[PDB]
Amino acid sequence: TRINLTLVSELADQHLMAEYRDLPRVFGAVRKHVANGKRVRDFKISPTFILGAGHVTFFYDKLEFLRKRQIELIAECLKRGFNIKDTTVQDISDIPQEFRGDYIPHEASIAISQARLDEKIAQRPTWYKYYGKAIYA
């Protein structure tokens, strides 16, 4: 599970696709927790944007920002001619309000997230495409 903070119109086709699948996972977790008698005070939510060890937890009090982003990844999928199913934004008004917070990333936290994405593409860039083209090398 990985949440990126980059503009989605700039994501490679594979990152667009992975994040589209991963986001609803978060939504999933928070639910299992709520039903296991869990609450936001029970989690060590980091103060800053984090990519490793507590990365998914960091978004446990920001499910609102994730709803608005799920919305942007679905539009972007369509825009590129991708045949996705689940065209639909998940309905989370089911989840306690304390978990549905917003987030506005500092330019510097977006850089964190940008560099991870840049490191993956540099692994083997023949594995990445943008709008179907191999603009990566």
Phi, psi and omega in degrees: 000125179217132179245125180259153180241017179277159179292131182293344180281353180254356178288146178288157181304329181281325179286324178302305180299320180287310180300324181299326180279325181285323182304307179300347178289311179309298179317325180293305180302310180304324181295316180301320180293303178312303179296355180253024181072019180276155179217159180306322180298339180282351181251144179276080181281119180295146179287332179244161179292127181235138180253339180257248180322284181268041181298309181292324180303326181303327180268009181293338180249013181231031181302346181283319179292324181290331180289314179296326179281324179301324179295316180286318180295326180292317180300320180292325179295313180296312179308326180268353181083043180258134181257089180262160178225117181114056178293344181265128179285138181285145180258115182252009179291003180280325179280126179322141181302320180309333180273338182267068179262172180248170182206140179229108180290137179288152179307321180294331179277330179290331180291324179306304180299323180291315180297329179294314179296321180287329181285325180291310181302323179289347179302287178219097182287001180275351178273349180242140181223151180233104181073019179099353180258149181268064181284348180269141181220000000 
